[PDB]
Scaffold this motif. Sequence first.
Motif, PDB file in Angstrom:
ATOM      1  N   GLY A 160     -52.075 -39.018  33.534  1.00 31.89           N
ATOM      2  CA  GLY A 160     -53.210 -39.911  33.471  1.00 31.89           C
ATOM      3  C   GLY A 160     -52.888 -41.377  33.277  1.00 31.89           C
ATOM      4  O   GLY A 160     -53.817 -42.189  33.220  1.00 31.89           O
ATOM      5  N   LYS A 161     -51.611 -41.747  33.178  1.00 29.47           N
ATOM      6  CA  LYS A 161     -51.248 -43.126  32.909  1.00 29.47           C
ATOM      7  C   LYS A 161     -50.471 -43.719  34.078  1.00 29.47           C
ATOM      8  O   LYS A 161     -49.652 -43.027  34.692  1.00 29.47           O
ATOM      9  N   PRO A 162     -50.694 -44.994  34.402  1.00 26.81           N
ATOM     10  CA  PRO A 162     -49.985 -45.617  35.532  1.00 26.81           C
ATOM     11  C   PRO A 162     -48.519 -45.852  35.196  1.00 26.81           C
ATOM     12  O   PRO A 162     -48.194 -46.525  34.217  1.00 26.81           O
ATOM     13  N   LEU A 163     -47.638 -45.294  36.018  1.00 26.81           N
ATOM     14  CA  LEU A 163     -46.207 -45.476  35.830  1.00 26.81           C
ATOM     15  C   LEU A 163     -45.774 -46.877  36.245  1.00 26.81           C
ATOM     16  O   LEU A 163     -46.331 -47.479  37.165  1.00 26.81           O
ATOM     17  N   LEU A 164     -44.772 -47.397  35.543  1.00 32.80           N
ATOM     18  CA  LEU A 164     -44.034 -48.583  35.963  1.00 32.80           C
ATOM     19  C   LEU A 164     -42.572 -48.173  36.083  1.00 32.80           C
ATOM     20  O   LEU A 164     -41.918 -47.890  35.074  1.00 32.80           O
ATOM     21  N   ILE A 165     -42.067 -48.136  37.313  1.00 30.41           N
ATOM     22  CA  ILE A 165     -40.754 -47.568  37.604  1.00 30.41           C
ATOM     23  C   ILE A 165     -39.680 -48.605  37.293  1.00 30.41           C
ATOM     24  O   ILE A 165     -39.604 -49.651  37.942  1.00 30.41           O
ATOM     25  N   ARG A 166     -38.844 -48.313  36.297  1.00 29.79           N
ATOM     26  CA  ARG A 166     -37.621 -49.073  36.042  1.00 29.79           C
ATOM     27  C   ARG A 166     -36.464 -48.270  36.627  1.00 29.79           C
ATOM     28  O   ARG A 166     -35.683 -47.635  35.920  1.00 29.79           O
ATOM     29  N   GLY A 167     -36.359 -48.304  37.951  1.00 33.23           N
ATOM     30  CA  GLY A 167     -35.484 -47.413  38.672  1.00 33.23           C
ATOM     31  C   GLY A 167     -34.204 -48.059  39.161  1.00 33.23           C
ATOM     32  O   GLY A 167     -34.075 -49.279  39.222  1.00 33.23           O
ATOM     33  N   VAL A 168     -33.246 -47.207  39.509  1.00 30.42           N
ATOM     34  CA  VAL A 168     -31.978 -47.644  40.079  1.00 30.42           C
ATOM     35  C   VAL A 168     -31.512 -46.588  41.072  1.00 30.42           C
ATOM     36  O   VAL A 168     -31.723 -45.390  40.869  1.00 30.42           O
ATOM     37  N   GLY A 228     -39.737 -50.451  41.158  1.00 26.30           N
ATOM     38  CA  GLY A 228     -38.808 -50.211  42.246  1.00 26.30           C
ATOM     39  C   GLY A 228     -37.483 -49.707  41.723  1.00 26.30           C
ATOM     40  O   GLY A 228     -37.292 -49.518  40.519  1.00 26.30           O
ATOM     41  N   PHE A 229     -36.563 -49.487  42.659  1.00 23.41           N
ATOM     42  CA  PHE A 229     -35.227 -48.985  42.361  1.00 23.41           C
ATOM     43  C   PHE A 229     -34.198 -50.035  42.748  1.00 23.41           C
ATOM     44  O   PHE A 229     -34.088 -50.397  43.925  1.00 23.41           O
ATOM     45  N   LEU A 264     -40.719 -50.182  45.440  1.00 23.45           N
ATOM     46  CA  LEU A 264     -39.587 -50.519  46.294  1.00 23.45           C
ATOM     47  C   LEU A 264     -38.487 -49.474  46.143  1.00 23.45           C
ATOM     48  O   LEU A 264     -37.935 -49.299  45.054  1.00 23.45           O
ATOM     49  N   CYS A 265     -38.161 -48.782  47.236  1.00 29.05           N
ATOM     50  CA  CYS A 265     -37.069 -47.818  47.175  1.00 29.05           C
ATOM     51  C   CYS A 265     -35.721 -48.511  47.019  1.00 29.05           C
ATOM     52  O   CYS A 265     -34.798 -47.938  46.432  1.00 29.05           O
TER      53      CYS A 265
END
Lengths: 982, 982
Positions: free
Chosen positions: B337-345, B556-557, B526-527
């Motif tokens: 139920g919560k909007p994700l914020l992707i701290r990706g790599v 993004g990643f 962003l991938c």
Amino acid sequence: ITDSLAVVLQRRDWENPGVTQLNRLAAHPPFASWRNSEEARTDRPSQQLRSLNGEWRFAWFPAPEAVPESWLECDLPEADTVVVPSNWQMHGYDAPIYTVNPPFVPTENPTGCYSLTFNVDESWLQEGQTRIIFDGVNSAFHLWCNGRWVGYGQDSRLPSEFDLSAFLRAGENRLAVMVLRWSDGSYLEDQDMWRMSGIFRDVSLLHKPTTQISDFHVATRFNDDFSRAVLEAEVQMCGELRDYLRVTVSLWQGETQVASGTAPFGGEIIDERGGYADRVTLRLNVENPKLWSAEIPNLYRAVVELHTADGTLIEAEACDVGFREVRIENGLLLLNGKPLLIRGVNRHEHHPLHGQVMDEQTMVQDILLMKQNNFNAVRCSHYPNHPLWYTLCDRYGLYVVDEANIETHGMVPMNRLTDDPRWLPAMSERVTRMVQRDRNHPSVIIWSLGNESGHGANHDALYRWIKSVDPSRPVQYEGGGADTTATDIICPMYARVDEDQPFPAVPKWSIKKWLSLPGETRPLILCEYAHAMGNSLGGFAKYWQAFRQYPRLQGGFVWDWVGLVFADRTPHPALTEAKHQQQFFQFRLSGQTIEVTSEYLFRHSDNELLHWMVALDGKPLASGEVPLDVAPQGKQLIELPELPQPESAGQLWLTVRVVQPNATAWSEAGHISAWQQWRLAENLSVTLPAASHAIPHLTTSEMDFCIELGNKRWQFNRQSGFLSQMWIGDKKQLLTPLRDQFTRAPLDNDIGVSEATRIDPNAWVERWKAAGHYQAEAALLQCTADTLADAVLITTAHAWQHQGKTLFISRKTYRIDGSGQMAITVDVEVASDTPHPARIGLNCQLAQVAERVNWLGLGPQENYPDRLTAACFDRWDLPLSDMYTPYVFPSENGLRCGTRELNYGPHQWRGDFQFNISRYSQQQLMETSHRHLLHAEEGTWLNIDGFHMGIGGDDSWSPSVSAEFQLSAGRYHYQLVWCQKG
Amino acid sequence: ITDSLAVVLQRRDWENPGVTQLNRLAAHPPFASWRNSEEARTDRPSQQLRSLNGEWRFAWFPAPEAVPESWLECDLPEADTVVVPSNWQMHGYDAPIYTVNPPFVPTENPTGCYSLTFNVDESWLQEGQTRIIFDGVNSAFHLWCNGRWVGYGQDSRLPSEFDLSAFLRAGENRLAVMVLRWSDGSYLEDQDMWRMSGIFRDVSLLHKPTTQISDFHVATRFNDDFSRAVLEAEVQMCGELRDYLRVTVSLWQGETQVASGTAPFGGEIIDERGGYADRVTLRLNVENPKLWSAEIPNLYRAVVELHTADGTLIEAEACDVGFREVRIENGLLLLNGKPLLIRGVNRHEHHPLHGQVMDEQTMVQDILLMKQNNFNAVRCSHYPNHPLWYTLCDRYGLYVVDEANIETHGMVPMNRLTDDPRWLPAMSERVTRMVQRDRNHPSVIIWSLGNESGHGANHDALYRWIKSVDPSRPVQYEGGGADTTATDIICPMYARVDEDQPFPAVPKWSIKKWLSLPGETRPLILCEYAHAMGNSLGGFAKYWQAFRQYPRLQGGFVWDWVGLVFADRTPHPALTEAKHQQQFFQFRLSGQTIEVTSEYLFRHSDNELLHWMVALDGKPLASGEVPLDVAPQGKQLIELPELPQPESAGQLWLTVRVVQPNATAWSEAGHISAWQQWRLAENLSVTLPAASHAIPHLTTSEMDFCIELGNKRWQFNRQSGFLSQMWIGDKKQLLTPLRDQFTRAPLDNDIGVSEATRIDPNAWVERWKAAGHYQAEAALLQCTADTLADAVLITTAHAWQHQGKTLFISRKTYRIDGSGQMAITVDVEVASDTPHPARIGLNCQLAQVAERVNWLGLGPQENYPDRLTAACFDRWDLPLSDMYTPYVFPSENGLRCGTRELNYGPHQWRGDFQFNISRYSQQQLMETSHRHLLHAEEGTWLNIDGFHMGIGGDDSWSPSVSAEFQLSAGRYHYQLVWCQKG
């Protein structure tokens, strides 16, 4: 070596779902490789396409391992000669079959070894690519050429092509094809028909140049009102790419070119890395294009020429182009902006005497018969068809549903393979190679993913592939409830008009209710409806009433064209009912005005003439002809002249019919396309019969009642209570006494799937047998005879009991007057708890056999309470042979409804009844398995019914006779008058 | 025979896209075949799963046909011994490669022949099924067991399993694996890394019972507020079906069972033919489930037991279950139920020294480093990972994007295979077998269809397959413009924040503009973004400003984890910038109030402490600690006490930092997770310097100007116009004269793809070279010296010309006062038509080498104008070694921005400047290819810049330095003061 049978057959490629082909070329539209543009334009035969059909050597083996290694080099000494486009089961090798380990096949796998010795001209081998095309080989096969293994193939219903350039030697060559009866592909072709195996389609050799056209497809785009069109053709080439190569696409209407385009190779930028260097797209603008439809099949000729920049031609390909748009808008399937109404039929590829081998003459014969019966669409029943079939549908005009060869109805979950990702590669090949072959045909308007395979994830993936590759056609699929996400059209099988069939997880809603389910917006077209097995198609008018009323009910496909016709293409009586319900002209009568509404969407009624006739009890009184001038979907009001008003008794009947004075490509001059009948005015008869001076004389004995009048005489058996004999002069008229009949020889709809092993208690015939209707014995309750002032009155009462339970009671009155007439009034009581009887009437075996049967009643053809709309009331005269319908499995047949007078020899029967007359008794029809075992009896069997149960037709395995056609009233009355030639 | 190499290799299965496997078993989640429920629950090692990793025999061959037939029976005499989980290129056989005929591979195909001799206990062979699992074999391989051919496989990145029951003999056995370097599968694995080949993953033997669990997957359903959950498990069995078989699924939280369910086999009705007899679905109800997330990875243990109705266990399987819901609602990707914020790599599987072989210790080291740098997500870069990777991401908490091994960026249309239906079977296997393996992992939240393969119809078909099979995860795919119909998420590669890149047919819009395009509703993640090649990651703060502001920009990643770290996992300076921009606590300063906003969605700040400090020019003045009590997404207002108000000159700085007092599973006690700095109050300095009594003395010659003051002395070359030497006592201080510098050793972002062959004129380094910035020669215009009342004034003017064109003009003033200080004011004019210079400053080679570098300025780590947000202003003391960044390819490095004072040995430099100090000159860095060839110079090279150009980072092949970080003003001024220890 590795070309030997031991090495080739060791991997068992026919038991591996992951191997569906080896060294097979890509699928493509048909190619002829013309070396001349004019020959391509006029569709002349090409010398680069050579047919290998003819005499081949054949050898049969019980298993693939039984084939000797020497077969690869030389023809066997015991090998016989066959015509290759054939099924080897038709030549008597193994038993044909009409009817699990999912990957594996039985080890006893019959193997057909074909071989051909042929010559190849040296010109084909110096340059260019030579390939062999197998249009159809049932199951799987291995190919050898001069002893060297070439490749392997499956998917019997699509062409398999192999490159033979490296294998052919100048001079004489030999081909060896090892055809297996069963493979892993058989699990996807597990439908219900004659199985059959062999090379059942054409084999040919095609020679292409070194640089060649490898693929091409055309797309047509339109403006809002279809006044402007763009023809986009994408051409792909194979071979060496040169900067001097050019592609020209020209569009021809007859012999006049209307559009042309030339461009070098190199397509538009596709993505970051660039575009196709071996592809070119040509855009051709057409002003006021002639649109293609089933009503008007306007065709252009598109010629694709591969040539050099200087002007020298390398290769030419051609195809027919129809300009039409198919899309679903607001829940309606539109063709060129108009809502289609599908008059469709399912058609299997079944030759009259060659099994599964199709030829042009049979295809043209089938198409003509369909269009003459108001069919406009055909469903390719469960596999892609012969390539020439689609060409003929373009030219004559027929909407075609092209179906992928996927059918797994024998699986116990029924989606066991279609939900398995390991079978996705196998099923994708069957879908993609069909689309790649047939995407250029204008007649193909809908893709079908297959038949009776449940619903799996593979269906959804393949559905989306078609939408991406070819967005110009809708995709339909029955399976998983006929309304899954893998179909653009709700396409139920045998859904009923008003009655719901809520099966678990796959309910069959009534089509009217199905449309209005919450969230449902798609159109509904029945992929299969109105099962025509045996004496069937009852309630057909119910479907077409619903089709007309509901916009989103856009028709359906009647099951089994061939079926609606016999194997020799002789029509069934139900074909007339289909033609009448599918008419393109609807009629409304209001006083002296006839309103004619056209159901055509595109054409004007320019070959139409209305002939009207008024008759009184079959006697014509007036007639006239009016030309038809109706716009598409318009109305023409036709005011009849002052109609005759006879003062003689009887009913006035008005009959109209639409006649085509000019011959078309699919019909001959004088073709009747539509008709309708009405009752105009009835004058009730009030005149009394003449005061006959004579009185019939009654004699009474302990065994019989005898009534004598002149030369006529009647005899009633006092023990039985039935009229036993009648004499005109000294000639007996009866062989069997006149008795009440409450049963009929069970129809295929009456039997269902009730075998002698798996009994079906819900079947009509099983309920009749359990209730004792076939074994009920008549018991006489009373039988009296009284002499009147001018007649003789006979009163009888019988009870039909089975195991201490009265099923029926019949009370009958016989009134023999002095004029010779015999009035018979019958009153029948039927117990409410017993199943409703199939019929209520009388039967007898007349001693006389006559040549002609004359009756005043409904229709020339046989008709039944729920299949009588196409029949017409008039005076009909037929030979006794035409009064019998030769169904393959004998049953009740030949009934004529709504009959007021029946004449047979010296006998006349008057009243309001239904009858059938033949040389076979209902008892013999019930016990005889096949019609060739039927033998004529000594006399003529006559069944006269006051009331008769309707026949089924919604399906053949479940009861489908509607309540309004069941004999559920409980009490029944009818009257009959029996007179003679006096 | 047919087991020989000649027969097996004759069909060339590695050159056929239609053959991807032979005799390979179905894909499934990992199995251990426990024979005890408690062992399965606690994840103890299973004796039924045996590892064959260890010493094998290896032989290399140039081509597959070069392998002798005798290899199939006995180990070769020259075969060496290797550890099987390895790449044979790491052992020096053929050269590894970092870098067409679409179906065919070169005939020179290096072949690695592996062999192992092992023992098998008789208990495995008497009963049950024994299989061998190859977790990864690069390209293709053929398998033999005791000289008998077993099967064939491809798709290097997924396990290949074969049944060995019929092949194993009691006692000693031998396996022979023929690994080929290239196959047709290599066309789908054509990405950019070290190619490498061999058996690079684990090999194991698994023993299953005769009746076994063949497959199982779990699904979690939730109510509106996630207070109630249903765990549905579908279990499939293989083997003989018995009515006494039962399946029990139990859910465990630690050692307490929370749910359980038992049922016999036989699933729900699927369609008309029925349901699965070999499947059962169990529904388990969980009240108040502990939800799984990256912040709180709450895991349950699901144990699936196959047992008899009496109670005897047959087999047990287990997996970890996380309760979470992933869906896209209203254009937002929601987790619980919560909007994700992707701290990706993005992360490739690259071992520090074993190439492509992954082991647990390296995976745990990578996960710890990621979480300590505020990363919460990882993209499996272009192929499925080691199975243990997904288990570790469940336990520690990391969102995972699982990517299918499809990569065809080398195709010229780039969709030549993905738009070809003949390659659909090959690509479907790569997608379906990944989903079947990893669908039970809670960490996997998104499926990826592959990487850089254009957009074809195969992508759409495979996208819809995943949606049908697993609707619980979104499907993403970059390719064809990153916003096609085959992706649920707009996932561009290297899209910029504000600048659009409208490439033909595949534009790269700015991410802000991309969201608002007409008809666009999807979220954007962003991938790939922020290319970290070399000295990079400039403008990283721009992306995260946009991520915070725009709801539908969900992160993004970052490309190349390893990259952000070196091979030995030593961190890059840019890793600090990523950690700061990815903090979960945001800070706002308003007067004396600090507002702390939590970016956590689920957890409360229960391990958080805020330490604040106030310093004046690096001198601490006050400090304090406040515990953090912030709800998820809440705000805590923290009122600072009365802060110190020093009356000494300088700027007041307030620094806050979040410290975790307790150790977690991924971090140690005292971990700093977030920080922020502000300027509080500045007191400008108004005090005058002390009235020095002395006056520097100026001597003039024809060659130099000499200024002498006490023991110090300066010398200015009159011919060159630059300060040439300075003497303290009799010790020289300089080896190279102090001269203006306008160039830097080009960064990887400055070079781009500009090779010596394919020059890129738009690259920054090419424009600088074409403009002559590296070849410009300084020309003296004027040089005067005047004696003041208390100082000596030196004025110089130089012009830098290249081929008759003035590029730069520098006017410099030297003021040597009586106190010993040296004030240097520089005014620089830059021509507007020349490309903007990389830097504007001075450089010199100091004769002294010192151990420590002390400066008052920004950050301990190197920082640049567009990569300085993570740096902090304070007094830093580092050894000279830490002032140099060892990039693999030498370039400009070690810059510190915002520096007010720099101390090195006896020298102090004051002003407002940026500096880097090292033993390598900018000239040497430009000419040295690799860092191992760098040699220290005689003295210390100091670069002091008033102004410096930003570094790129949006991509590495195109100019990406923003306009606000380019030196485009045209005129520049800066001042420097140079003093000594006096």
